Design an enzyme around this catalytic site. Structure first.
Site, PDB file in Angstrom:
ATOM      1  CG  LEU A 143      -2.270  -0.603   1.160  1.00 33.83           C
ATOM      2  CD1 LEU A 143      -3.040  -0.425   2.485  1.00 33.83           C
ATOM      3  CD2 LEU A 143      -3.051  -0.029  -0.004  1.00 33.83           C
TER       4      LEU A 143
ATOM      5  CD  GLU B  85       7.758   2.178   1.044  1.00 34.99           C
ATOM      6  OE1 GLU B  85       8.892   2.091   0.544  1.00 34.99           O
ATOM      7  OE2 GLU B  85       6.985   1.204   1.113  1.00 34.99           O
TER       8      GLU B  85
ATOM      9  CG  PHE C 280       9.904   5.654   8.257  1.00 37.85           C
ATOM     10  CD1 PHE C 280       8.789   6.137   8.959  1.00 37.85           C
ATOM     11  CD2 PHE C 280      10.016   5.937   6.888  1.00 37.85           C
ATOM     12  CE1 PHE C 280       7.811   6.876   8.313  1.00 37.85           C
ATOM     13  CE2 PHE C 280       9.038   6.668   6.237  1.00 37.85           C
ATOM     14  CZ  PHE C 280       7.933   7.142   6.946  1.00 37.85           C
ATOM     15  CB  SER C 281       6.916   2.187   8.808  1.00 36.12           C
ATOM     16  OG  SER C 281       6.695   3.555   8.551  1.00 36.12           O
ATOM     17  CE1 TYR C 282       9.830  -3.058   4.723  1.00 36.88           C
ATOM     18  CE2 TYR C 282       9.665  -1.148   3.251  1.00 36.88           C
ATOM     19  CZ  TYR C 282      10.413  -2.159   3.821  1.00 36.88           C
ATOM     20  OH  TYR C 282      11.736  -2.265   3.493  1.00 36.88           O
ATOM     21  CB  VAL C 283       1.290   0.609   4.894  1.00 34.20           C
ATOM     22  CG1 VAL C 283      -0.168   0.289   5.207  1.00 34.20           C
ATOM     23  CG2 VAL C 283       1.835   1.644   5.880  1.00 34.20           C
TER      24      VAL C 283
ATOM     25  CE  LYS D 156       3.269   3.288  10.847  1.00 32.87           C
ATOM     26  NZ  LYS D 156       2.742   4.464  11.622  1.00 32.87           N
TER      27      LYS D 156
ATOM     28  CG  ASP E   3       2.317  15.681  10.992  1.00 32.96           C
ATOM     29  OD1 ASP E   3       3.046  14.707  10.762  1.00 32.96           O
ATOM     30  OD2 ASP E   3       2.271  16.685  10.230  1.00 32.96           O
TER      31      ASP E   3
END
Ligand SMILES: [Cl-]
Length: 291
Positions: A22, A24, A25-28, A43, A142
């Site tokens: 889907l 993105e 430090f991180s993937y989704v 996530k 944010d």
């Protein structure tokens, strides 16, 4: 030959099927639950230090502070490792419509915008979400259109609670001001960041009205097809200066809506409204649901 390959994971004793990346430090990852048929966004946060496990715990905990329709819920949290690879996973609901931003680009690419009744419904949803956050003593910090998902009934849903913190912050002295200024330079998208968080003053009180400024920018974005400081950002000049200085009456907008936008984007936070007042003003316009 009649079986088929797939990749899966187990979370809270339940099997989920990989579908596609889907983003993105991180993937989704988009995954499908095989017990219930529903889709989810998984996530995955990469950990190299203990701090990383801690930051992910924190975020998971922000999600379970709330059970509100305008705030993304957490389906499950867990820790996974294999050999040296360590990860923390947040399982979340999947919103096929994606974000408020890509809806307002979809229109701006055909030459259109959201109608005033659409704008009023969306804004009401975002304020009620914030109201629930503020009432518990936090600020989001944010807020921006790419942190707002659209649900299957067109409801707006706030996500990304990894910069949420206590709403009220007392700054006494240069050292505290500067540590706060650096923290914001890190966690608050510059073009949506409240004036009082650039050049943080040595003695002051930063409260949740920080979010009311960001919400003003989101509203502006909905009304004009871009954020009020995006040309400045994208054309390389100084956002920090633009934000400290200070809207058109495009007759697609009631002056009531134009007054809402003006009040949110006041630079002196002492003159900026809190959410409960904004909601009072908004609900008197008796915003229609979609249908
Ligand atoms: Cl461990």
């Amino acid at each position: 030959n009649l079986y088929f390959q797939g990749h899966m994971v187990i979370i809270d004793n339940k099997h989920y099927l990989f579908i596609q990346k889907l983003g993105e430090f991180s993937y989704v990852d988009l995954v499908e639950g095989l017990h219930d048929g529903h889709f989810y966004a998984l996530k995955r946060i990469l950990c190299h230090e203990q701090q990383d496990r801690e930051e992910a715990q924190r975020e998971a905990d922000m999600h379970r502070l709330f059970n509100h329709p305008n705030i993304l819920r957490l389906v499950a949290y867990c820790l996974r490792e294999r050999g040296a690879k360590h990860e923390a996973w947040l399982l979340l609901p999947f919103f096929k419509r994606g974000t408020l931003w890509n809806e307002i680009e979809r229109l701006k690419d055909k030459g259109n915008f959201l109608t005033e009744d659409q704008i009023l419904w969306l804004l009401l949803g975002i304020c009620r979400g914030l109201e629930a956050i503020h009432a518990k003593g936090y600020a989001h910090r944010d807020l921006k259109p790419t942190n707002i998902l659209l649900g299957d009934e067109g409801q707006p849903v706030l996500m990304d609670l990894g910069s949420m913190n206590q709403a009220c912050i007392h700054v006494e002295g240069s050292r505290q001001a500067l540590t706060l200024q650096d923290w914001a330079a890190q966690r608050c998208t510059i073009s949506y960041r409240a004036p009082e968080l650039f050049s943080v003053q040595s003695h002051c009180v930063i409260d949740e009205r920080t979010d009311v400024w960001s919400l003003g920018c989101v509203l502006y974005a909905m009304m004009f097809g871009e954020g009020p400081y995006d040309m400045v950002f994208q054309k390389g000049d100084s956002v920090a200066l633009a934000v400290q200085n200070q809207i058109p009456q495009s007759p697609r907008h009631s002056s009531a809506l134009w007054q809402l936008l003006n009040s949110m984007m006041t630079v002196d936070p002492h003159q900026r409204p809190h959410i409960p007042l904004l909601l009072s003003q908004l609900e008197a316009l008796q915003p229609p649901a979609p249908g």
